[PDB]
Amino acid sequence: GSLVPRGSHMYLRITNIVESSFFTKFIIYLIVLNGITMGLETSKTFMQSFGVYTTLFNQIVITIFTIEIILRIYVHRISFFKDPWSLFDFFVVAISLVPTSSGFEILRVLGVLRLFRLVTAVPQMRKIVSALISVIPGMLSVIALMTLFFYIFAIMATQLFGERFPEWFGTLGESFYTLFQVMTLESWSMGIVRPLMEVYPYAWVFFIPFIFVVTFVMINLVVAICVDAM
Amino acid sequence: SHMYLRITNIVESSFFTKFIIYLIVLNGITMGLETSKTFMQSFGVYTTLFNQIVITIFTIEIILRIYVHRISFFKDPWSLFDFFVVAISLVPTSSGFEILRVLGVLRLFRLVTAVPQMRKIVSALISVIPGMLSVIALMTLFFYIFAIMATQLFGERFPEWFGTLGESFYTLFQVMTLESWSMGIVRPLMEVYPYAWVFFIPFIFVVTFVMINLVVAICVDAM
Amino acid sequence: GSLVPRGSHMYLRITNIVESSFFTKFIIYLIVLNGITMGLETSKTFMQSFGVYTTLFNQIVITIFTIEIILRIYVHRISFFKDPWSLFDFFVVAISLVPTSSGFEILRVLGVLRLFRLVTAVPQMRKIVSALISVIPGMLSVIALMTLFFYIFAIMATQLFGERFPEWFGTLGESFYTLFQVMTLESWSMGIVRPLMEVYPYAWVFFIPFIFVVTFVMINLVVAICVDAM
Amino acid sequence: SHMYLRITNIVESSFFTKFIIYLIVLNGITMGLETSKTFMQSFGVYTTLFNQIVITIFTIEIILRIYVHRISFFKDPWSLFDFFVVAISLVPTSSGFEILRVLGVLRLFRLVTAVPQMRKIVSALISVIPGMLSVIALMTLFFYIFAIMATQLFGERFPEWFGTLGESFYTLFQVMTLESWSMGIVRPLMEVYPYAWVFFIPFIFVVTFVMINLVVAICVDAM
Ligand code: NA
Ligand code: NA
């Protein structure tokens, strides 16, 4: 493979650096250091004392991480952009590269996602994430079914309850949101359906069978993962 | 037979199912759009005419499917669902109640009908239900007995929650889901009836114990 | 067996009556009839119209049921009082025999328990109750453990929170009650622990580990029934 | 050895364990009674003297158990628990905090220590925990990342729920238990931050998905 390596005179030179155990260790060390520093940046008292420290520390770590991804791309070439873990690394570092201002501060908040590089860089963490994720394919049909089910009941509820209950059902999205809440069973009766039954006494004919189905499916979804994994 | 084979090759074709599924999805999209009051002031007429067109196509389709499948049609659960959900959608713009207009949205479940693999998951989910009916039966009897009890123990001083058998069923269901059962129901009940806990706690143990066994059944009965 | 039968001249006479399929059918028929009549007695409107009907119907059914248990005891003799289903039958009919007044009306309400004779008299209902119940022996240790656990944390909470929160923790029983509620996770935070953290900011150090344990055990209890039954 | 064998037969005996268990249960009963303010006005002195007597016996017991078991004692988890829970109970009537007086009730968990079969269930429950640490670790990291995010997205306008990393941890735990997460937390958050749902819904999916897999593990890993 590798098609046309960078040398392989300096290709191998940087490859042994990148491929080393020290290289991974140092990076992980910085992940943990930056994770600690990010919790510290949460205190307004710490930021009034050591604000400058952590801010420069931050931009320093991010420079190292960018160089790291660059070195890893020269070594792994095309293989890099075919590796989900490396892709996550790339995108979570790229996010972190957007200037101190501009756009919105969501990009600054999403910067904290780089701490998930602990999962990337540490094996066994990969292994558990990998195990959890591979369970998802045998769920897509049920998820698909459930999504269609929510969509149909959201449309119904929007048009049955939206005019007299705009906050909870005024809009398709509002209805989706509220139906999700009912599925988690959070205040479904005292907070949503009892108030609904004061105008619409048969509202129970809608939410109870909704609750049976959504619950029945969730149970089968779990049993699936119990059986499909066992 | 004569023209029987003629329409059968139409109905039985790959094109025929595709076109129908295409209309399911199109009509499903059109139904979400009909939710927006802004969309309906602009393209209201469009979507309304689109709707009556789709429903006419679906009616012709079911007719064609019955001529081909004859008796087999009304013995097929999927076709029956198709039939009833299209018939629902045939009820006039007014008259009766508007539940029928709302029940029209149920025709989107024809996506399940028309797409294989969706049948498969619905089929898998449903076949799990027979080995549950005895437990369901037991639970229903249990709800019935405790609903009657709650009606006559708590109904006079707590009419909204227990004044009526139906109200009691409803409240007991809520307690089973554990939703506000204490802060919202049993603590208030205990300001009048301090031993109310002797009723709802064992009720909660039983209903929970059964649900756990009901699930374990589906864990076991399906495996 | 049977030691000394009643004859067996009339012993066999009543035995064939009692042992018949008709005998069971008739009784079941009355269970269902009385169950229907009991729901009807819930309506204040029905009781103003057909109150006399159902009340006499009730005392009639109860007389038949007492005769039934009597006939069953003469036939089954000692075997009767060794049969859990017959014992339930006996006690649920005896409850139903207590006079129209006297004591409390709990005895009138407990009368509705006789509808569970549907489970007794119908096979397959026995079978599911039997299946559910037999699962309980392999649970007694965990239940025992949990009961001890609740007892210890109830004592702790009574003495940590009872003075400033008499309703929720003023008394061992109040504490038991509240801890049960926290276990069902019902309003545990917004309704109990957040108000508790306004005086006692470390209350979370008590309820969070309580919630982990009680939840962890519940999960293992279920897995037990999953494995012990599978 | 000399008197080593003399006390060993005492400590190792069936009588010795029984008497101790007998005192566990007696002291446990006495601790519930000490909860009643009425009982304490009548028999307060009795139970207090009973308490110091039991604790002195327990201290002698642990000393005797250490002379017999020597090094083996401090390598036995059950004996360590015994030791620490008795030591806790040795702290003077005042000084420090009264948490130590409350932590004294933990000595009732010596019922688990002293009664076999109780060990067995505790042992079974605990051995299940090693095959969970990776998932626990993943979840803790996940909470940490989302807590930091919530602190800086919602902390200024919602100090009580998200003003501080610790507050955010607490609130996120609550959302994970699904307790009032919508009516009590996310709907209020959405009156200021209408896209807050983009944060809590995926948070709820993940935390739930993991819990389900965590359980399935214990279903599988134990079977
Ligand atoms: Na409300
Ligand atoms: Na409160």
Residue C39 is nearest to which of B138, B148, B179, comparing CB atoms? B148
Do B63 and B137 reside in the same domain of the chain? no
Q: Which residue on chain A is closest to D174 by alpha carbon?
A: A186
In-domain check, residue A216: yes
In-domain check, residue C2: no
Q: Which residue on chain C is closest to D215 by alpha carbon?
A: C219
Tell me which chain C residues have a C-beta less than 8 angstroms from the C-beta of D109: 148, 152
Of D51, D70, D99, which Cα lies nearest the Cα of D11?
A: D70
In-domain check, residue C3: no
Provide the number of CB pairs (under 8 Å) joining chain C to chain D: 77
Q: Which helix or strand (DSSP H or E) is residue A168 part of?
A: helix A166-169
Provide the number of CB pairs (under 8 Å) joining chain A to chain D: 75
| Gap from CA of C180 to ligand 2 centroid (Å) | 16
Of C108, C104, C85, which Cα lies nearest the Cα of C96?
A: C108
CA atoms within 13 A on the CB side of C101: 0
What's the rounded Cα separation, in Å, for the pair B100 and B91?
A: 7
SS3 label, residue B201: helix
| Domain total in chain C | 2
SS3 label, residue B91: coil
Amino acid of residue B211: M
Q: What is the CATH number of the domain that holds A155?
A: 1.10.287.70
In-domain check, residue A2: no
Q: Tokens 């109310």 sit at which residue?
A: B196
Inter-chain residue contact D179 with C185, CB threshold 8 Å: yes
Q: Any idea what DSSP says for residue D36?
A: -
Inter-chain residue contact A109 with D183, CB threshold 8 Å: no
In-domain check, residue A97: yes
Do C122 and C20 reside in the same domain of the chain? yes
Q: What is the CATH number of the domain that holds C131?
A: 1.20.120.350
In-domain check, residue A5: no
Which chains lie within 8 Å of chain B at 3 or more CB pairs, if any?
A, C
Is the preceding omega at residue C8 within 30 degrees of 0, hence cis?
A: yes
Inter-chain residue contact D138 with A116, CB threshold 8 Å: no
Do A197 and A126 reside in the same domain of the chain? no
Do D24 and D104 reside in the same domain of the chain? yes
Do D122 and D112 reside in the same domain of the chain? no
- DSSP percent split of chain B into helix, strand, coil, nearest 5: 85, 0, 15
Do B46 and B137 reside in the same domain of the chain? no
Q: What's the burial of C120, exposed, middle or buried (CB within 10 Å: 0-12/13-18/19+)? A: buried
Inter-chain residue contact D184 with C190, CB threshold 8 Å: yes
Residues with Cβ within 8 Å of B115's Cβ and at least 6 positions away in sequence, in order, are B21
| Gap from CA of C110 to ligand 2 centroid (Å) | 33
Pair of tokens at residue B65 = 């499917």
Do B221 and B148 reside in the same domain of the chain? yes
Do A177 and A130 reside in the same domain of the chain? no
B184 is in an annotated binding site: no
Relative to the alpha carbon of C188, which ligand is closest?
2
Do C17 and C123 reside in the same domain of the chain? yes
Pair of tokens at residue B179 = 């939703």
For C199, phi then psi, to 5°, come to -100, -45
Q: Which residue on chain B is closest to A187 by alpha carbon?
A: B179
Inter-chain residue contact A125 with D137, CB threshold 8 Å: yes
Give the DSSP letter string of B107-131: GGGHHHHHSTTHHHHHHHHHHTSGG
Inter-chain residue contact C145 with D218, CB threshold 8 Å: no
Do C131 and C98 reside in the same domain of the chain? yes
In-domain check, residue C1: no
| Gap from CA of D158 to ligand 2 centroid (Å) | 19
Experimental resolution (Å): 2.5
D28 is in an annotated binding site: no
Q: How far is CA C2 from CA A178, C71, C73, in A?
A: 65, 15, 12
The Cβ of residue A91 has, within 10 Å, a number of other Cβ atoms equal to 13
What's the rounded Cα separation, in Å, for the pair D211 and D217?
A: 10
Do D121 and D108 reside in the same domain of the chain? no
Residues with Cβ within 8 Å of D142's Cβ and at least 6 positions away in sequence, in order, are D206, D207, D210
CA distance A5 to chain D (A): 37
Of A177, A39, A96, which Cα lies nearest the Cα of D196?
A: A177
Inter-chain residue contact D213 with A191, CB threshold 8 Å: no
Q: Any idea what DSSP says for residue C87?
A: H
Residues with Cβ within 8 Å of B161's Cβ and at least 6 positions away in sequence, in order, are B154, B167, B168, B171, B185
Torsion of CA B149, B154, B158, B160, to 10 degrees: 0
Q: Among A70, A104, A135, which residue terminates a domain?
A: A135
What's the rounded Cα separation, in Å, for the pair B69 and B75?
A: 10
Q: Among C82, C100, C135, which residue terminates a domain?
A: C135
Give the annotated binding-site residues of A for Ca(2+). 184, 187
Relative to the alpha carbon of A168, which ligand is closest?
1
Q: Among A135, A160, A178, which residue terminates a domain?
A: A135
Tell me which chain B residues have a C-beta less than 8 angstroms from the C-beta of A159: 35, 102
* Residue B207, domain extent: 117-223
Residue B165 is nearest to which of C39, C116, C187, comparing CB atoms? C39
C contact set with B (CB within 8 A) = 35, 38-39, 42-43, 108-109, 112-113, 115-116, 118-119, 124-125, 127-129, 131-132, 135, 177, 180-181, 184-187, 191, 222, 225-226, 229-230
Do D66 and D137 reside in the same domain of the chain? no
Relative to the alpha carbon of D187, which ligand is closest?
1
Q: Which helix or strand (DSSP H or E) is residue D55 part of?
A: helix D44-69
Q: How far is CA D81 from CA C98, D75, D84, D190, in A?
A: 54, 11, 5, 48
SS3 label, residue A218: helix
Inter-chain residue contact C148 with D122, CB threshold 8 Å: no
Give the DSSP letter string of D101-132: HHHGGGGGGHHHHHSTTHHHHHHHHHHTSGGG
